[PDB]
Homo-oligomer: A and B are copies of this chain.
Amino acid sequence: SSVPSQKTYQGSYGFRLGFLHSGAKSVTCTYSPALNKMFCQLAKTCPVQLWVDSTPPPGTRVRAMAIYKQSQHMTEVVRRCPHHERCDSDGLAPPQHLIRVEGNLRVEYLDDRNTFRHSVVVPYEPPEVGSDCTTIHYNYMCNSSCMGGMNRRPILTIITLEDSSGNLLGRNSFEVRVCACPGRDRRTEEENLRK
């Protein structure tokens, strides 16, 4: 009961995610729709669009949390490796958190008091007049390969729309690989998929 659900849930507000088109072997961030997987470099900007069919009420929040994808590792909390944990904080993000948000004055970093899982939360803001969507800029602060952290294990990022009390309004998820060469690794994984 300590691993959060990843089940997609558009909910009453029609909550969906969108991703940008990207460029290179070493592109900073690129999303594979075939794999529903984001490939990015350590600490680079990963834009994620939030789409809704209708505006949720005031006090709605947007939470991001990583979990390991594989059954064998689901119950292990995703955290930064010891090496990077001792390195690059912005004053708000605790050094142990993998996922950060940039460019948001109201960001909150949470350590669940029962599961000890990390997450990062911002208020939901509606798009400008109109718009079609709102964009959050996430950063992942370890490579998937980091020894003593993710240790080459795939993760999912779970994005939830929640009320102020943490009740679920919507949920979406995508896989992530943080690596040196996102364009190479996207092409490799897509070719293995179509094989």
Is A105 close to B, CB under 8 A?
yes
Binds B, one of A53-61, A80-88, A156-164, A185-193: A80-88
Contact A75 B47 (CB under 8 A): no
* Contact (A105, B2) CB under 8 Å given A47-B71, A75-B137, A82-B85: yes
* Contact (A103, B74) CB under 8 Å given A147-B146, A147-B147: yes
Tell me, in angstroms, the Cα distance from A122 to B114 when the chains sit together. 16
Tell me, in angstroms, the Cα distance from A74 to B103 when the chains sit together. 8
The quantity of this chain's copies bound in the complex is: 4
> What residues of chain B lie closer than 8 Å to A44, measured between beta carbons?
72
> What residues of chain B lie closer than 8 Å to A106, measured between beta carbons?
1
> What residues of chain B lie closer than 8 Å to A29, measured between beta carbons?
71-72
Look across to chain B and name the residue whose beta carbon is closest to the beta carbon of A70: B45
Contact B83 A147 (CB under 8 A): yes
Distance from A108 Cβ to chain B, minimum over Cβ atoms (Å): 13
Is A165 close to B, CB under 8 A?
no
Look across to chain B and name the residue whose beta carbon is closest to the beta carbon of A2: B103
Look across to chain B and name the residue whose beta carbon is closest to the beta carbon of A83: B148
> What residues of chain B lie closer than 8 Å to A144, measured between beta carbons?
none
Is A28 close to B, CB under 8 A?
yes
Q: Besides the contacts A2-B104, A71-B137, A146-B147, what 18 more A-B pairs have beta carbons closer than 8 Å?
A: A2-B103, A5-B128, A9-B129, A28-B72, A29-B71, A29-B72, A45-B72, A45-B75, A47-B71, A74-B137, A75-B103, A81-B83, A82-B85, A82-B148, A83-B147, A86-B148, A105-B115, A147-B147
Q: List 8 A-B contacts (CB under 8 A).
A: A1-B104, A45-B74, A74-B103, A81-B82, A82-B82, A83-B147, A83-B148, A105-B115
Q: Closest 8 interchain pairs by CB?
A: A83-B148, A75-B103, A82-B82, A2-B103, A45-B72, A75-B102, A82-B83, A47-B71
